[PDB]
Amino acid sequence: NDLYRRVINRNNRLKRLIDLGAPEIIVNNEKRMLQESVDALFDNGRRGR
Amino acid sequence: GAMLDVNFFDELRIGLATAEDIRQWSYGEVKKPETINYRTLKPEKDGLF
Amino acid sequence: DRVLRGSRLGAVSYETDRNHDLAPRQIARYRTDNGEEFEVPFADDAEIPGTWLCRNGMEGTLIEGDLPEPKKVKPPRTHWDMLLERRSIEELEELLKERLELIRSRRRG
Amino acid sequence: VRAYLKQIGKVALLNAEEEVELAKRIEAGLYATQLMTELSERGEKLPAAQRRDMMWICRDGDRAKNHLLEANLRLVVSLAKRYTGRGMAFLDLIQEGNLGLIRAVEKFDYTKGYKFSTYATWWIRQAITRAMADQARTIRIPVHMVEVINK
Amino acid sequence: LAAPVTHIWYFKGVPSRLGYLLDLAPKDLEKIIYFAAYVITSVDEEMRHNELSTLEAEMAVERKAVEDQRDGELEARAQKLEADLAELEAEGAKADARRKVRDGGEREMRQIRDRAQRELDRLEDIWSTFTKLAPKQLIVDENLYRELVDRYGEYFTGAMGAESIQKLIENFDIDAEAESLRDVIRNGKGQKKLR
Fold first, then answer.
1. Looking at the DSSP assignment, which residues form a beta bridge with residue E137?
2. What torsion, rounded to 10 degrees, do the Cα atoms C74, C77, C81, C87 define?
3. How many Cα atoms sit within 13 Å of D43 on the Cβ side?
4. D27 touches chain C (CB under 8 A)
5. Which among D11, D98, D99, D102 is the top mutation candidate for probing chain A, defined by the most A β-carbons within 10 Å of its own β-carbon?
């Protein structure tokens, strides 16, 4: 539930930023942390930490 | 026919997911990071529960 | 040593699954924007709203054209409007014309 | 995080006069695109050269806003660094600080004569604290009970 | 999900199945899927083919204007250097300090022409890479990618990330690569055949 909640938060924040209209540094950093969250959900501990 | 799960198996085949198959499986779209209410202990709306 | 108890938040009944004398059912049909029917079995004694949430992702409307009301939707906080709440028309137009004159003298020479 | 530090290493820093000038360019570009839409729908005749140079005004204001946010990104990182170990990791605080930067740069006036970071610090801290309240726990708790829990 | 995201099993578990399918290094796929390097999706060939001639004429004209700026800067610095010569030689004193301003002017002319050569190399590099434009090409230095956007941003399509991988796989017919791999393993030998 913690991992699912984390992915929900990142996805909602990215949807809010993409309807808002933001610079690419913010948007792509949000995309990167979303991708890392999905990887941490599917197999926690494979890549990175 | 893995819908009503009859008691007559022949083969078990694993494949690969598609987005259309996933949204055909699902019974909604979770969009809030909420689980229970802190006081009434009842599940929330459009959350994980 | 450590033996606990506990239960999920919910109670369990014990009935018989008869399949004949059910409540009378009306079947309602909704539709999303992208042509997606979602058949909704209501009661026969049931009001049918014009809109209903579906698994498709959005609130799919009725398949009827009886209730087509699109009215109450607007963005309440636009940057232009909250600019207007703090800045006046003549001041903003003066700034606009000053920057237009600057860019005319820059691009033109 | 290290990649984000290298990404925010590219940016520069400005002063209050340049912030006022950037806000003037932003509001001029916003008036330019409002007039562009205004003459787009039910307009009579959009001038070609005036439409081109006010399109360049609008693009200049947008890029000015982008570089303003890029300049304040390091400031919002240094502001957000004092919230480690409270529920979330650093990245959520960083992005909430970006949201607070967007809200403050909407809600800022160029005739204040105020420093932009000193203006925006309340907004950033407010956004970070309210998001910490929202995403603190597994079960959401209302903010007033959060306040009395803090007390 | 608002934006696509790839699986973790098809990227990280060695051997990287996606990397084997699209013929990339796995560490060089990591930069794509973790948003640290730009990758070109597709690039036109006929429009790029006629714009080779037309934009090489444009490129030569731009380089000529650049060289005009370079020789103008070199001539202005040389005139300041001759002014240093005239305003050191006119007073009869120890010429060691009087040679210092001359050496500073020479060093200034050197850095002017060196910086001009560097931006000329930048022009040569952007045209050379535009001539070298192929799909599945990593582009590091997104500032240089922005240079590619502002000058030669047409005639190709690029993206960055999981949706770029999605675009790549969508525009990827496997049958031609299957026949090519069949021909390689039938005819050749060695490390390339093993791969």
1. E40
2. 170
3. 12
4. yes
5. D98
